[PDB]
Write an enzyme that holds these catalytic residues in place. Structure first.
Site, PDB file in Angstrom:
ATOM      1  N   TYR A   1       0.876  -1.163  -0.522  1.00 39.33           N
ATOM      2  CA  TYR A   1       0.111   0.123   0.305  1.00 39.33           C
ATOM      3  C   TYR A   1       1.345   1.387   0.405  1.00 39.33           C
ATOM      4  CZ  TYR A   1      -4.921  -0.666  -0.065  1.00 39.33           C
ATOM      5  OH  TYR A   1      -6.253  -0.468  -0.716  1.00 39.33           O
TER       6      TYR A   1
ATOM      7  N   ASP B   1      -5.188  13.133 -25.853  1.00 41.47           N
ATOM      8  CA  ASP B   1      -4.511  12.141 -25.088  1.00 41.47           C
ATOM      9  C   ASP B   1      -4.098  11.446 -26.300  1.00 41.47           C
ATOM     10  OD1 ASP B   1      -5.128   8.783 -24.527  1.00 41.47           O
ATOM     11  OD2 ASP B   1      -7.902   9.370 -23.929  1.00 41.47           O
TER      12      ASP B   1
ATOM     13  N   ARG C   1       0.307  -2.643 -18.815  1.00 42.06           N
ATOM     14  CA  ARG C   1      -1.539  -1.634 -18.772  1.00 42.06           C
ATOM     15  C   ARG C   1      -1.670  -0.924 -17.845  1.00 42.06           C
ATOM     16  NH1 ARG C   1      -5.090  -2.994 -22.767  1.00 42.06           N
ATOM     17  NH2 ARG C   1      -3.751  -4.930 -23.019  1.00 42.06           N
TER      18      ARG C   1
ATOM     19  N   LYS D   1      -0.285   0.374 -24.993  1.00 45.08           N
ATOM     20  CA  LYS D   1      -0.790   0.869 -27.082  1.00 45.08           C
ATOM     21  C   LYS D   1       0.872   0.678 -28.127  1.00 45.08           C
ATOM     22  CE  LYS D   1      -5.567   1.861 -26.152  1.00 45.08           C
ATOM     23  NZ  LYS D   1      -6.257   2.626 -26.818  1.00 45.08           N
TER      24      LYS D   1
ATOM     25  N   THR E   1      -2.585   5.374 -22.428  1.00 43.53           N
ATOM     26  CA  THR E   1      -1.930   4.569 -21.972  1.00 43.53           C
ATOM     27  C   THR E   1      -0.450   3.933 -21.825  1.00 43.53           C
ATOM     28  OG1 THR E   1      -2.534   4.064 -24.019  1.00 43.53           O
ATOM     29  CG2 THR E   1      -4.232   3.785 -22.135  1.00 43.53           C
TER      30      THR E   1
ATOM     31  N   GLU F   1      -0.689   4.812  -1.198  1.00 48.67           N
ATOM     32  CA  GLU F   1      -1.075   6.209  -1.004  1.00 48.67           C
ATOM     33  C   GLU F   1      -0.009   6.991  -0.792  1.00 48.67           C
ATOM     34  OE1 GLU F   1      -4.491   5.730   1.254  1.00 48.67           O
ATOM     35  OE2 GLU F   1      -5.445   5.156  -0.426  1.00 48.67           O
TER      36      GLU F   1
END
Ligand code: NA
Ligand code: NA
Lengths: 419, 420
Positions: free
Chosen positions: B54, B200, B235, B229, B226, B56
């Site tokens: 974790y 984008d 991913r 691609k 992303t 955060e």
């Protein structure tokens, strides 16, 4: 040659930092209540070629070619989730607990609607109405907290808040709440005021799955969760509901409502984790998780520490440090100095700011996964107490370091990796 | 004993399906334009114990203890992203391209504000204003499209739409657009009307990174992408900006604004992929991606097929079936029958339902990663054309199947991965 060999050869910087993180996990008491050690089998799915597949849509109803085997895997994940939680519907695509919650909001609410959740400083989650999160920025968030006299929920008080505020959605399920949640009482409250009811069971999902905590699924309109806390799976989210028509609307809110492609390697890990949770061993593990948390809380109390609400019925606790004249930030530092990993947390009615706090949140899931028992968790409590009671004493410091090292040596973590 | 051995022992059902997916990737021409084959090193990071942490917050500014090594990894990812794209700020935590876009919306907009993006049917993304996505449900999304005459953007026309609509945010960067995007012209348009500008670049990010497509970072308020691609990473998503003060606001919109814990195993994979993209071999790969897509487009045209806009400047193309007696759904099925994986796709001005379509989207990144060259992509075009011109011909079908198998055998995929 292995993928790890390629990593070492092509990016020694990242390879070495990753190996240091493995050693870190092995050589600390990992007491962060929301962490666990997921299985080798789950990690194998996350390291697979499933990452290369685009699979927008649902099994047999995809926007991309080539999904024959992804569809088999995702349908196993869905079917095992429905079995494990006794749910008529499950969506295994949410990227996280936060994204699961947002898809639920997109289905049930519009901007400006009123949501009611537990106060962030009493243990509610940031996605349940915090001003810094979309839930408080785009919705009218109102709050309930725990009782000052018990440090746990007073359901008659929650009902009065609900009647005064008339929220469209009530959220239960929390990030630092140590007692059993009564979902039947939340349903009675929601019905009285005409609200939807969401249970975000992220922390307690493994205890729910194994029967060690009451089950929200038959009572709530929708149940969200992370897959990675007590459920011991890969990092991601899940939406469950008793209403299968409503579940189809949640599907549409996951995709195309809020996400694009799902993480199919992670979804294979979810299938594996749900399969592990369906085994009898996982029910024994979950019982041990609770027994271990209670043993640690009780021994901390024997050593003079206050536990918020006076104990725990689940895997976690908050230590209220105002007794030993420390802040949560100070206590977190002091235990980190002896190789204990935790996090600070506000207590209910905390006089300190959220950047300082009066609490330390501790939980048993990760070290229970390593095989520790109740006497081992009483030893953890004594190490913590020794350090926090004698923060200037170098010999106590080293004794704590040594006692942590003994616990870590007795209970190896992933011993087949980088041995 | 390995993690894969544990998977076979404890969950043979999933183990077997995962193996079948590896075989499927090996034995098909993977022509899905948004796919790639990420490296063994990236996969190793995603299969690591980093999933247990974790984390955060941000490096050195976490809400959880124990992040010393996670902080070193995430900062390497940030630093490499900034170097690769020439950005003043980068946030490597978005779980996906959709989540990167949402964090941008949370920073710049309030519900009900007006956004302007490309129409979905002209190749805009669902997160750029589709009514089925939060972007068109909770914002008023207006659209621009391509020219009916050229089937590519007409910047004077986009300007006229912007002047009439006065959007608060203009979005460029697309899911099925084959031509170079002029970000300087989009900046001129946004400035004329007072709008923010988001690019984008999900599809083209690897071409941007290698200098084979103009860079939007100097011109736009913010760039999302992303990582998986043309960038060939794990991913996930990424937010970049030229403005470090905006960067601080985007960080807060990722966490606590939109997400909880980041996926630090995936972030280690982003670091690895950005490091791969900084090398000269990645620039050569990206140039080959374009040459290969152009060779396939040109040979499809030589066979009598139409390509939307008349060709491609990048890795992708749409075969336009409006004047052919097959739908896009049928063309996708027919190529799948000879072990070619693609997707049906709406074309600009498509008369067909989005469940049917009149297009087939094809791209070169994944098979270029396997080593194919331009002559091999001309061969792919000829296999596709043979099958689509003769959909019922069983001898042609078997010849196509053999020709696909020949390419797959000549250019193996992940040959070191064995069965458990
Ligand atoms: Na609000
Ligand atoms: Na047609």
């Amino acid at each position: 040659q292995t993928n790890l060999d390629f990593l070492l050869q092509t990016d020694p910087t990242i390879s070495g930092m990753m190996q240091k993180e493995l050693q870190r996990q092995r050589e600390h008491l990992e007491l962060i209540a929301s962490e666990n050690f997921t299985s080798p089998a789950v990690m194998a799915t996350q390291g697979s070629v499933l990452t290369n597949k685009y699979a927008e849509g649902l099994p047999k109803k995809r926007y991309y070619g080539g999904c024959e085997f992804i569809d088999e895997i995702e349908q196993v994940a869905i079917d095992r989730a429905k079995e494990l939680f006794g749910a008529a519907s499950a969506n295994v695509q949410p990227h996280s607990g936060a994204q699961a919650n947002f898809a639920v909001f997109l289905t049930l609410l519009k901007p400006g609607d009123k949501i009611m959740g537990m106060d962030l400083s009493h243990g509610g989650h940031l996605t349940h109405g915090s001003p810094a999160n979309v839930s408080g920025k785009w919705f009218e968030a109102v709050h309930y907290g725990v009782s000052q006299e018990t440090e746990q929920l007073d359901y008659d008080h929650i009902l009065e808040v609900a009647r005064q505020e008339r929220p469209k959605l009530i959220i239960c399920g929390y990030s630092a709440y140590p007692r059993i949640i009564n979902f039947e009482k939340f349903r009675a409250i929601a019905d009285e005021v005409g609200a939807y009811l969401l249970a975000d069971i992220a922390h307690i999902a493994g205890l729910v799955a194994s029967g060690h905590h009451p089950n929200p699924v038959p009572h709530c309109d929708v149940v969200t969760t992370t897959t990675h806390k007590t459920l011991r799976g890969p990092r991601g989210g899940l939406i469950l509901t008793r209403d299968p028509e409503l579940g189809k609307k949640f599907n549409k809110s996951v995709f195309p409502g809020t996400q694009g492609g799902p993480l199919e390697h992670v979804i294979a890990g979810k299938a594996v984790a749900f399969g592990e949770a369906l085994k009898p061993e996982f029910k024994a593990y979950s019982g041990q998780v609770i027994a271990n948390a209670q043993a640690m809380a009780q021994q901390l109390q024997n050593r003079g520490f206050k536990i918020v609400s006076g104990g725990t019925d689940n895997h976690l606790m908050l230590v209220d440090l105002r007794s030993v004249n420390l802040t949560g930030k100070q206590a977190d530092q002091l235990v980190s100095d002896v190789n204990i990993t935790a996090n600070k947390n506000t207590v209910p009615f905390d006089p300190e700011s959220p950047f300082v706090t009066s609490g330390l949140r501790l939980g048993s899931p990760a070290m229970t996964t390593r095989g520790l028992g109740t006497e081992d968790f009483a030893e953890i409590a004594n190490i913590i107490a020794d350090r926090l009671q004698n923060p200037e004493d170098e010999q106590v410091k080293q004794a704590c370091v040594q006692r942590v090292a003994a616990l870590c040596e007795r209970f190896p973590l992933y011993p087949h990796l980088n041995a």
